[PDB]
Amino acid sequence: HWGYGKHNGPEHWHKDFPIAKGERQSPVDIDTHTAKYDPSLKPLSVSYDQATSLRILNNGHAFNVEFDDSQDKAVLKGGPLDGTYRLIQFHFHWGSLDGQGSEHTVDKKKYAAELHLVHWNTKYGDFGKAVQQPDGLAVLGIFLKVGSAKPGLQKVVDVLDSIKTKGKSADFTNFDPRGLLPESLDYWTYPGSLTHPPLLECVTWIVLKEPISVSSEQVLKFRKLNFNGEGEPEELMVDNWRPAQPLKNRQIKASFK
Ligand SMILES: [Zn+2]
Numbered sequence: 001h002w003g004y005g006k007h008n009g010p011e012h013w014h015k016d017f018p019i020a021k022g023e024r025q026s027p028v029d030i031d032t033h034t035a036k037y038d039p040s041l042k043p044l045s046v047s048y049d050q051a052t053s054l055r056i057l058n059n060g061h062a063f064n065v066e067f068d069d070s071q072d073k074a075v076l077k078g079g080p081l082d083g084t085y086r087l088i089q090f091h092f093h094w095g096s097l098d099g100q101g102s103e104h105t106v107d108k109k110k111y112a113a114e115l116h117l118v119h120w121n122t123k124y125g126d127f128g129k130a131v132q133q134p135d136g137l138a139v140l141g142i143f144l145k146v147g148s149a150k151p152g153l154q155k156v157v158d159v160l161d162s163i164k165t166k167g168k169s170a171d172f173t174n175f176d177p178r179g180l181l182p183e184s185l186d187y188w189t190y191p192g193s194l195t196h197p198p199l200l201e202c203v204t205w206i207v208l209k210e211p212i213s214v215s216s217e218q219v220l221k222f223r224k225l226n227f228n229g230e231g232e233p234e235e236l237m238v239d240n241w242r243p244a245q246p247l248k249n250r251q252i253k254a255s256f257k
Contacts, residue, residue, distance in 0.1 A: 152179020
């Protein structure tokens with residue numbers, strides 16, 4: 001099945017998922033000098049006060065922190081978006097070392113990791129329907145650099161030992177994703193895709209300019225996870241990022257100058 005290795009990684013995905021070579025694939029490199037400042041872009045509205053996290057899952061590729069999305073409790077609106085998008089899950093992508101891990105790049109700079117908060121457009125009723133539409137998802141992407149610890153990340157870090165291997169999950173209630181945000185909501189935006197199979201071209205990407213800082217110890221705990229299942233040969237969960245894809249006929253817009 002697909003993964004991140006030599007034998008099943010991003011350069012292979014197009015065989016089972018031909019949309020891998022499509023017209024609006026993600027991630028991309030953000031060329032800061034080419035991105036157009038767009039004064040029509042509104043401030044992002046991130047409303048996570050009523051977010052209900054439920055569970056954390058090691059899915060064999062990353063770990064997902066899952067939310068109750070049965071009502072409008074944690075939503076993303078404004079920015080480049082029309083309508084209301086409900087938070088379903090967040091996850092990360094990270095590297096074997098601090099010099100790689102992010103999926104988007106900024107003037108070819110790779111960050112140590114990238115957080116994706118995934119939200120679906122409520123006008124399509126459920127996530128499975130939303131991913132079939134070109135405006136079905138909004139993914140908020142946040143870079144991670146290594147330096148000072150992120151206090152609001154530590155609860156995530158300290159549950160990882162309980163979900164070491166693929167298919168393990170744990171209760172993860174009352175987690176506040178506001179603690180993962182940077183100070184500024186300045187962003188870049190462009191139309192793209194899911195960055196892992198099925199690679200569906202359903203995402204409005206919103207990538208924050210300001211990275212969050214996490215500690216080396218925090219990221220090291222991400223790197224102790226396993227791609228494999230319980231008792232199987234240990235394969236550390238590292239380098240679970242897709243590289244930058246061709247921009248093709250797309251414009252990256254900035255909310256700031
Ligand atoms: Zn992702």
